[PDB]
Assembly symmetry: C4
Homo-oligomer: 472 residues x 4
């Protein structure tokens, strides 16, 4: 009765073909879906790479043009330690902004005031932020402070093809000094794709930051690009307009077809399951809390459904980005990359049809639960070690400041990396604190030994036991 | 008779609940103790982090302000090789100290003489130490020396809102030159916590050190902070005065309750044990030297007692530190971190109640003795290698100077780290000493091979044998 | 009948010697072939090393002489950011070319015009490439561009024992600026071999590259040597003319003899096989699709034949290179190195004659298929991870730009290398993109854990199972 | 008969004590020998360390004083690229030598002429070496060269408490330029030991090396110390004269006693063996080629004899060094370190008396032969890979120049070190040679995979099989 139905439902594709029904249509559909998803991802990645290089090189040029005394490397630890140093840095930034068209190797254009910092007609705004009242006096031990940041800002307007040299900076109340301006470029490098009308607008922010009030003011330069269409389309675009959008709609249609087929199959499985519980109610025998009624389901279809949902949701956003006003590449790239990862993991299913590959897969499937329980135990011990190391070695070593950093350092240590650099960093404070040095010796030796000579060996033992159980 | 008593004593908590007695009160007490200890540690660590950053940034500013020709990095290998170089360094330090209020980006205050080096009214003291009699003469081979360090010191007093330029430095008898001064700051960064009255006093020591008499005088700058209350309290402190001290007394009370409960339980175990030895004296049978009468004890209660002792002893010192005159963070942080590590290791006990986690724990408990015996053997071989490597490769390579450094280098080598850097450091003296180069080749190859291909494999074999014994 | 024939065919060499036939002639021929191939490779490698050092040192001297502001290291990140910077770099290059004979520490000679860039009488040609029409205007959003690179070039002729200072560089249309010149040297270092008439001609190309149009123009110096005979032979060459060519013809003859013997043996095996299929047709029994009729063959003879083909094909090209007009060392070195690798792998055959070494070899031969199937599964998962990591972490981290680079980074990570450097590189953008930072944490932890604690353990399990099957 | 004798000969020390004979005299003698050898090694190492630091710091001071434009680091890649650069370097060296007493921070003394380069009265000799006849002409392709190095040298005599500025350097025939001078110092740092009369004499050699004739002349500074007694002894030496020599003679006597006891024991074993072969000749039974007659011997006594021979031979040389004219620390340190390594390995013998440690030792003793046979096979494959990698990647990457360097790089790669740095170094020439880049990809991936996933797994399998055989 239901015997033949469940037989066919649990048959492999080859035995299905042998018994009844036509060829592996869904299987070759999934093959072509793998192909189109990978090709789409590669096409997206090449263009993103070629635009990221342009953005980075323009930022490097901006740093070398506007930061005084800047040299490659040293992007951190670039600061000011003297009032004249800070004044010279600020005045150099503003003078280079005013001299840009005569000295720069690129071609930029000024942007007149159209936002919050820039008033009408101004292209650069240097704004300083201080406290409304501050009477810091390290002598007599009195400060008399009320934090309410006041902003006093100057606007500099550029010339066409003074009043900032009178800046007084209020060093004892200063919070930060910032410089805002914008520069329009044209990406001529886009003559390979012939999609040249990439017509950027960089927003440059130079920050002189005085939060810590340490006498050391770090200096930074961050930028933000805003891509557009540079009012000159369809010179070579007649041949490339159709290809990208047609490939995107092909991907969307293939993934929607895959989703509908897998939904049909999952509904079929659900109905067969509910038939089985009823007919087992008929004889009313071997029933338990029924956790295996969930084992009736097919996990590969769940994986496939998730992958096509992610693929179509990311392809919609890619369509929006590459032509329309969508500017959010992070989420789109995360969606597309996760979908491609899942699509490529879904080949393990085509490998479990053959006996030997199925042995190698069943070994891991059998070993996984013990691995996760051991991961619980090791989790708790490793978290204790992370807390102890953070709290003790934080004040002395910069690799142990954040909990994320101490976690990364320990995870690198249990795999053999930066081990002697860590040990030497600890060695560099023996004279400062012999007690902390001795604690660091005990801590590092104990942790590395316990986690390399006793935990990884047990992971190996678990996997080997699983392999032996499978091969017998 | 005693059968039911020992039954209940050795029952698990679930079977205890099933047989007689109320709920796991001690177990949930230990859970809330884990929680409060971890939260206290995190609260302490955040504030220590935020103060250590301030101290470090002020020290960096001091180095860049007072050391002549100083650049980031190069904190070692910063020295002087010429008399005019040393004179210019000293005079630059003193001139920057005198010019600080006009040039510094921070706000500091001078400290008039109140200690040993500083006489009345002086803020800076540059003191040179030489020998009482020294007639070093490399020619004729005569030195005629009697070491008795004499200190000749100058005091410079600062001005308010000369006599050191006449320094003669006695280069052939010099031991060191030092510069001592103090600077008062106010930690305005403490406006997040609103606990702003952190009103430091840095003690800066600039050392020109001539111990080796090599013609190379290294120059260093060390500082020491002395936190205080800056005579302006209770502006926002009304809301934060109670929270920290209340949390500390809550931790103290929870840990004292835990300690008393575990002491009750350990006394119970002792009395049951002494009852067992007597009733076994009654029948007078299966008695040996009685090492298992100690196996009657519960190690988890020992761990818990140690952890609460450490926690309360460290919380008392934290209470002393954060408000009173206690300034010793090293011991307090070590105590708190060790207590948190032990408290988080104490969850393994809650995992050994279930069968599968108990298998994973019993495997390690069974494998530990063989691991420690193999560690004895490997100890002796590794110590021989450390001695040989130190004595032979010490004179040529700086990674092999100290016994602690050669031990760290070898422990990193047996785990795959800095291996090629070590080999290349050895390669860099083939022309100097072919014999030492060949010895270093043999030494490094032999050690790494013997310790990677024969010792770690035996650790794996021990753990795998233990796992197989447990699973059968 | 055929029983004795197949007995002798499958006998080992020792049992062959015991039963019938003379000594291991082919085996000792292969031994002397190993010897001569290794000696030839070493002789070739020493001379290539000694010439590569000369080429590299001349290129370093060229960089320090012609690049303005160049310092060791910094071979990348050497660029120009200002019009005057670029002009000064170009003029410094040309002035140093004109001043070379008075300032250089080597001895070079000028090469008058004999090629495409250099017209008659000119030694240096500085050529700039721009667009035929370009109206880039970042303001108003208009570019009006048609890419057709026009080359405007200047020729500078050197003096014997002006007109380039009038260069205008067209910065808004520029593609690149190049400088071409040649310099003749004589390798006097070849007085050890006494093969001194190495009389080079370096072609130096200095590129000022403006592809990205970023405002940052990287500057590079590449060279190309062209070895010759410097019209002064046979001063010491009478003793060294014969040795190299005689050794090369000895290698050729030995490898041809080896090839002919192995071809005889393979034909013998083929004829015995075709006799076996016929006589099995006689009784007409245990026949299948006959995959073992291919197992009749000897793989070691295939390896040997390939190795002698590669050796003779590379020795012909080495003969051509070292005296004649052949200048292609890459292919010759690849051929010779592959042939030497195969010749040294062919000793495993001499080890499989003894029982214990044969056990160690048969273990690997039995474990190889499972290893390759697991490599298929791991291939697909690892490729999914590579695609996801490239697409997501490409825009932010330079180790993830190319697919080859992300593959190398992941392959290094699963073996414990640059792990914490990767983690810290990710940490450096938490403030920029918390979302990408969290994704990178999940990604790296998941990948390293899955590939270290579950895949390598299964490789170990496969090899251990194979060893246990072999030893029983 | 002989049964009781062989019983006692093969008894353990505890069973010997139980059966007949007094206490473990030889065993506690070996314990005190371990102690004295380790203490002697430590005492030697501390003093060698403290003198090596002085030598190194004086060399650093010499480099910073005499090399023009020298900065810490950059000890390689320090060269000259211009005639005026070389002239200025030479003249700066000589001027600093003449100005030393007025500018140096150490105290040095001039050494008048008493050797080969220095004639009478001269302290510094700058000598240039060129060819007797050289007509290098890169144009016309003619060199006309006969190598016969002629030395033209200048002598500069120092003043007391010109003619080198007229140097012409013959740049087209130059081989090298050298500068030789000596400086007497006094090690005042030896006031801790009070063994102050360490009265050195540094021989400084500054080499301007032009072997390659590349236009790049590297510049180096090497020194050589010559310790002496500085004509002022026995000021504090009355208390330290006896201790070192008494400890050295104690070590010599202890090691000679150990050697004589072990020689007695080995002769005893030989005589018992020769008795056994005779009495087995009596019954004339179970005799073979008799490899076990050598198994009659005790390897621990061989190890001990070698260790005491090395210890006494190195202690004689240490006695010679620390007071007499012996100046060869390399051989002495090698002897002492090897003897200490052997003495500390000799504790494994005291561990094999107990059953569990003996199991852990017997596992390794049983696994060693299979390990060595697998090492033969892996040897041959790894040597093939080394040859191929050297010959192919030598011309492009500096880590692959020497066979020793490629061997160190590969041995580091199979253990997970500098793997991504190697891969990136290869990546840096994709544009230069795509073919060599592709070969390097195949080469590195193949090697690392074959050696990590197939060879170390087999080492683990061998050790695990040995452990299982021992535990059953
Ligand atoms: C794909 O997941 C895995 C897949 C296969 C095996 C293990 C994991 N693991 C490791 C990955 N995760 C770690 C992330 C970083 C910190 C939190 C976890 N460290 S841990 O539990 O103290 C730890 C430390 C050493 C060894 C085993 C666990 C936790 C699951
Ligand atoms: C938590 O302790 C452990 C826990 C689990 C396994 C091993 C240890 N070990 C290793 C940690 N300790 C080492 C500290 C540094 C020097 C002294 C010891 N090195 S060793 O005995 O020559 C050595 C060298 C290689 C492998 C095994 C021992 C010694 C106990
Ligand atoms: C000599 O070949 C081998 C010999 C012996 C064992 C394994 C291999 N392998 C590893 C070498 N090859 C890799 C090259 C780089 C990327 C492509 C392959 N990576 S992988 O299949 O995702 C992978 C990742 C981790 C472990 C096992 C496979 C693929 C065959
Ligand atoms: C104490 O000796 C050992 C002790 C215990 C195990 C192994 C060795 N080995 C390794 C040490 N020696 C190596 C020196 C460098 C080059 C020559 C040899 N490399 S290898 O035979 O290709 C090779 C490569 C990978 C794994 C195993 C052998 C060769 C004996």
């Amino acid at each position: 009765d239901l015997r033949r139905r469940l037989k066919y439902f649990f048959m492999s594709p080859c035995d299905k073909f042998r018994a009844k029904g036509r060829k592996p249509c869904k299987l070759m559909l999934q093959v072509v879906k793998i192909l189109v998803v990978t090709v789409q991802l590669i096409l997206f990645g090449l263009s993103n790479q070629l635009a990221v290089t342009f953005r980075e090189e323009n930022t490097i040029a901006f740093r070398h043009l506007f930061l005084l005394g800047y040299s490659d490397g040293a992007d951190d630890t670039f600061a000011a330690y003297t009032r004249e140093q800070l004044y010279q840095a600020i005045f150099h930034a503003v003078d280079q902004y005013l001299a840009l068209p005569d000295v720069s190797l690129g071609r930029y254009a000024y942007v007149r005031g159209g936002g919050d910092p820039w008033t009408n007609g101004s292209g650069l705004a240097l704004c300083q932020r201080y406290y409304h009242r501050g009477h810091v006096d390290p002598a007599n031990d009195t400060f008399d402070i009320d934090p309410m940041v006041v902003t006093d800002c100057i606007q500099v307007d550029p010339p066409e093809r003074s009043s900032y040299k009178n800046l007084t900076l209020k060093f004892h109340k200063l919070v930060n000094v910032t410089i805002h301006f914008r520069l329009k470029t044209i990406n001529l490098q886009s003559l390979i794709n012939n999609e040249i009308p990439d017509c950027y607008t960089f927003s440059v922010l130079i920050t002189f930051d005085n939060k810590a009030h340490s006498g050391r003011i770090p200096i930074s330069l961050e930028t933000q690009a805003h891509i557009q269409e540079c009012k000159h389309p369809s010179v070579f675009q007649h041949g490339d307009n159709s290809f990208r959008l047609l490939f995107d709609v092909v991907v969307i249609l293939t993934c929607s077809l895959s989703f509908l087929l897998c939904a049909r199959s999952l509904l079929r499985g659900f109905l067969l399951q509910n038939e089985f519980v009823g007919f087992m109610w008929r004889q009313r025998g071997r029933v338990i809390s029924l956790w295996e009624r969930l084992e009736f389901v097919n996990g590969w279809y769940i994986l496939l459904v998730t992958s096509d949902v992610l693929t179509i949701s990311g392809t919609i956003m890619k369509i929006g980005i590459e032509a329309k006003n969508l500017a959010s590449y992070d989420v789109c790239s995360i969606l597309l990359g996760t979908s491609t990862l899942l699509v490529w993991v879904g080949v393990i299913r085509y490998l479990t049809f053959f006996h030997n590959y199925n042995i190698l897969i069943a070994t891991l499937r059998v070993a996984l639960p013990s691995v996760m329980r051991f991961c619980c135990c090791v989790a708790v011990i490793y978290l204790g070690y992370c807390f102890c190391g953070w709290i003790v070695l934080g004040p002395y070593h910069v690799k142990f400041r954040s909990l994320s950093m101490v976690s990364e350092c320990l995870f690198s240590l249990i795999n053999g990396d930066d081990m002697f650099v860590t040990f030497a960093a600890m060695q560099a404070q023996q004279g400062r604190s012999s007690l902390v040095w001795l604690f660091s010796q005990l801590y590092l030796y104990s942790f590395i030994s316990l986690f390399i000579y006793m935990v990884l060996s047990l992971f190996i033992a678990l996997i080997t036991g699983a392999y032996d159980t499978i091969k017998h």
